[PDB]
Design an enzyme around this catalytic site. Structure first.
Site, mmCIF file in Angstrom:
data_model
loop_
_atom_site.group_PDB
_atom_site.id
_atom_site.type_symbol
_atom_site.label_atom_id
_atom_site.label_comp_id
_atom_site.label_asym_id
_atom_site.label_seq_id
_atom_site.Cartn_x
_atom_site.Cartn_y
_atom_site.Cartn_z
ATOM 1 N N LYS A 118 0.820 -1.206 0.000
ATOM 2 C CA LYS A 118 0.000 0.000 0.000
ATOM 3 C C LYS A 118 0.858 1.261 0.000
ATOM 4 O O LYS A 118 0.445 2.294 -0.537
ATOM 5 C CB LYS A 118 -0.952 -0.020 1.194
ATOM 6 C CG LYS A 118 -2.415 -0.135 0.799
ATOM 7 C CD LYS A 118 -3.179 -1.067 1.725
ATOM 8 C CE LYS A 118 -4.673 -1.040 1.429
ATOM 9 N NZ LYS A 118 -5.423 -2.076 2.194
ATOM 10 N N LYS A 238 -17.373 -5.809 1.891
ATOM 11 C CA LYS A 238 -18.403 -5.477 0.917
ATOM 12 C C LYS A 238 -19.541 -6.485 0.961
ATOM 13 O O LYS A 238 -19.324 -7.699 1.003
ATOM 14 C CB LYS A 238 -17.807 -5.423 -0.490
ATOM 15 C CG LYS A 238 -16.649 -4.457 -0.637
ATOM 16 C CD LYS A 238 -15.816 -4.786 -1.862
ATOM 17 C CE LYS A 238 -14.819 -3.682 -2.167
ATOM 18 N NZ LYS A 238 -14.143 -3.181 -0.938
HETATM 19 N N1 LIG Z 1 -8.756 6.281 5.870
HETATM 20 C C1 LIG Z 1 -9.958 5.699 5.828
HETATM 21 N N2 LIG Z 1 -11.020 6.387 6.299
HETATM 22 C C2 LIG Z 1 -12.224 5.813 6.263
HETATM 23 N N3 LIG Z 1 -12.558 4.603 5.813
HETATM 24 C C3 LIG Z 1 -11.489 3.945 5.354
HETATM 25 C C4 LIG Z 1 -10.185 4.405 5.324
HETATM 26 N N4 LIG Z 1 -9.340 3.450 4.779
HETATM 27 C C5 LIG Z 1 -10.141 2.453 4.496
HETATM 28 N N5 LIG Z 1 -11.453 2.682 4.815
HETATM 29 C C6 LIG Z 1 -12.576 1.770 4.627
HETATM 30 O O1 LIG Z 1 -12.095 0.564 4.065
HETATM 31 C C7 LIG Z 1 -13.099 0.061 3.168
HETATM 32 C C8 LIG Z 1 -12.489 -0.939 2.221
HETATM 33 O O2 LIG Z 1 -11.137 -1.220 2.638
HETATM 34 P P1 LIG Z 1 -9.906 -0.825 1.735
HETATM 35 O O3 LIG Z 1 -10.354 -0.567 0.353
HETATM 36 O O4 LIG Z 1 -9.176 0.336 2.401
HETATM 37 O O5 LIG Z 1 -8.948 -2.088 1.830
HETATM 38 P P2 LIG Z 1 -9.097 -3.640 2.150
HETATM 39 O O6 LIG Z 1 -10.479 -4.016 2.496
HETATM 40 O O7 LIG Z 1 -8.037 -3.992 3.188
HETATM 41 O O8 LIG Z 1 -8.649 -4.286 0.779
HETATM 42 P P3 LIG Z 1 -9.275 -5.078 -0.453
HETATM 43 O O9 LIG Z 1 -10.271 -4.231 -1.168
HETATM 44 O O10 LIG Z 1 -8.067 -5.461 -1.313
HETATM 45 O O11 LIG Z 1 -9.879 -6.337 0.172
HETATM 46 C C9 LIG Z 1 -13.654 1.321 2.524
HETATM 47 O O12 LIG Z 1 -14.956 1.100 1.998
HETATM 48 C C10 LIG Z 1 -13.676 2.306 3.699
HETATM 49 O O13 LIG Z 1 -14.916 2.279 4.393
HETATM 50 MG MG LIG Z 2 -9.932 -2.685 0.112
#
Ligand SMILES: Nc1ncnc2c1ncn2[C@@H]1O[C@H](COP(=O)(O)OP(=O)(O)OP(=O)(O)O)[C@@H](O)[C@H]1O
Ligand SMILES: [Mg+2]
Ligand SMILES: CC(=O)SCCNC(=O)CCNC(=O)[C@H](O)C(C)(C)COP(=O)(O)OP(=O)(O)OC[C@H]1O[C@@H](n2cnc3c(N)ncnc32)[C@H](O)[C@@H]1OP(=O)(O)O
Length: 463
Positions: A118, A238
């Site tokens: 990241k 999601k």
């Molecule tokens: N700085 C932030 N402030 C608020 N919400 C955040 C922030 N960073 C991430 N999120 C939340 O994370 C959710 C999805 O996670 P993100 O896209 O950051 O990565 P992940 O779930 O770890 O990765 P991937 O999509 O590869 O599974 C977003 O819909 C959001 O609600």
């Molecule tokens: Mg994500």
């Protein structure tokens, strides 16, 4: 020269989807399966099937690079499609596949290296002039994180670099809570990925998780296929993805898609990829790039008419994106309608969303106008093991108007019948019944701030 045999290093519905794409493209297919996955649908949906990871855990069996490569070489597969998850983003898998001479259906190795981390992805977005979330530079320790909280202020979002799917990710607004969050995130990062790289960043309140689908070509042609809205999330996982973002203004969506195209063009991206954004009151911020086919590519396929997996295979073949595949220009990419994706899974919304196990005694699937069905292993008589993911079937409804897509998803969810295992269908029904989702103005905090979503009605269920 041209590939003829293709191997899918995945399982479930995504393997069947790639099998269908390969059959439509005239490519013979090869499946791999673990011993505990012997009754999976994807094993019998292929021309050849080979057992992988004998004497291992089934997850590690699907994660074994050397056995998959050996199976692909013995079977004679000229290409390996990794699907989503498992080894789809694994740099070592793709490196060893390209070392063996086989075709890896995915981006170039440098893209996987950049977008695996990241910090590296944020740096690449900075060189691409795509504004990321204001956060600390690189990955810091606990005290550097506390200093960032001092200069920028609460709330602060603690995310591990390799943390994916909400593993190491945790919010903080107080100093003690931030210590707790850093401790838990460090434990999850060491346990799951072995590298405790933690970067902290400012926590946007009530954002929309917009993501943009990108198709890259080896010739240099890069187009987007509009954007999906994945704001409907339970604990940052999601649940329901809609496409396009009907709540957002079309000009704003065009700006977000153009920013994703600019980033992918700066990095020279190839094959299929998804650029994720957080949208808050006319400001969008880059958060990550998923350099693979995603689970919710189906709704993008519906609203654009473009077969994403077939395009993936043809790009891995080296075809031109416009001349050979036949995709139109970016201005001519159509927005045919508005589609909704719901993954019907086994996790029990009345028992803390824990993945339930059991035997499926009856299985009834809807059909008709405006319905797309993508099923994993959900047939009658299938025993749901705790080994794999809870995904039974992805279902999508598409319509010209978002309201009719909501209506058809309601019809499908009420029509759908899996007994013997308990599904999230009442949860999905409650979510799509809500006016915030129906207006398209759902945010990532919509589920967690709506207790009425969990009032699941009593079902008579005679039989
Ligand atoms: N700085 C932030 N402030 C608020 N919400 C955040 C922030 N960073 C991430 N999120 C939340 O994370 C959710 C999805 O996670 P993100 O896209 O950051 O990565 P992940 O779930 O770890 O990765 P991937 O999509 O590869 O599974 C977003 O819909 C959001 O609600
Ligand atoms: Mg994500
Ligand atoms: C199909 C569509 O257009 S969208 C969804 C609407 N579906 C229907 O109207 C079909 C008829 N209704 C039903 O099957 C159910 O009652 C539902 C969908 C309303 C949900 O109620 P449930 O609590 O889950 O089951 P219910 O107690 O009411 O019915 C018991 C059984 O009798 C069946 N049944 C229901 N109505 C009839 C009927 N008119 N004739 C014969 N059998 C029927 C059901 O299929 C069900 O069998 P199942 O285990 O395979 O699902």
């Amino acid at each position: 020269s041209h590939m003829k045999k293709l191997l899918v290093a995945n399982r479930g519905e995504i393997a069947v989807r790639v099998f269908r794409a390969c059959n439509e493209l005239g490519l013979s297919t090869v499946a791999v399966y673990a011993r505990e996955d012997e009754y999976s649908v994807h094993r019998f949906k292929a021309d050849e099937s080979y057992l992988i990871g004998q004497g291992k855990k089934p997850i590690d069996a699907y994660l074994d690079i050397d056995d998959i490569i050996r199976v692909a070489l013995e079977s004679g597969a000229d290409a390996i499609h990794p699907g989503y998850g498992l080894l789809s983003e694994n740099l070592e898998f793709a490196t060893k596949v390209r070392a063996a001479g086989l075709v890896f259906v995915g981006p170039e190795l440098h893209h996987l290296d950049i977008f695996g981390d990241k910090i590296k992805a944020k740096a690449a977005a900075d060189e691409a002039k795509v504004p990321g979330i204001p956060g600390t530079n690189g990955a810091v320790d606990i005290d550097g994180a506390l200093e960032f909280a001092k200069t920028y202020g609460y709330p602060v979002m603690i995310k591990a670099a390799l943390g994916g799917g909400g593993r190491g990710m945790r919010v903080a607004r107080n100093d003690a809570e931030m210590h707790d969050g850093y401790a838990r995130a460090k434990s999850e990062a060491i346990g799951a990925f072995g590298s405790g790289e933690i970067y902290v960043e400012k926590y946007i309140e009530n954002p929309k998780h917009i993501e943009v689908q990108i198709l890259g070509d080896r010739h240099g042609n890069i187009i987007h296929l509009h954007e999906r809205d994945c704001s409907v999330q339970r604990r940052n996982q999601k649940v329901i993805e809609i496409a396009p973002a009907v709540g957002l203004s079309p000009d704003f969506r065009n700006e977000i898609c153009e920013a994703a195209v600019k980033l992918c063009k700066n990095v020279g991206y190839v094959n299929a990829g998804t650029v994720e954004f957080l949208v808050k009151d006319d400001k969008f911020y880059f958060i990550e790039v998923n350099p693979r086919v995603q689970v919710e590519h189906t709704i993008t396929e519906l609203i654009t008419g473009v077969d994403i997996v077939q395009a993936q295979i043809l790009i891995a073949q080296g075809k031109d994106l416009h001349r050979e595949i036949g995709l139109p220009a970016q201005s001519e990419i159509p927005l045919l309608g508005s589609a909704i994706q719901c993954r019907i899974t086994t996790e029990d919304p009345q028992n803390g969303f824990l993945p339930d196990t059991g035997k499926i005694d009856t299985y009834r699937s809807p059909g008709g106008f405006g319905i797309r069905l993508d099923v994993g292993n959900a047939y009658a008589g299938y025993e749901v093991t705790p080994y794999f993911d809870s995904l039974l079937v992805k279902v999508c409804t598409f319509a010209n108007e978002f309201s009719d897509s909501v209506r058809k998803m309601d019809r499908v969810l009420h029509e759908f019948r899996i007994r013997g295992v308990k599904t999230n269908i009442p949860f999905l029904i409650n979510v799509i019944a809500n006016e915030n989702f129906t207006s398209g103005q759902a945010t990532t905090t919509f589920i967690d701030n709506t207790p009425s979503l969990f009032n699941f009605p009593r079902l008579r269920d005679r039989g």
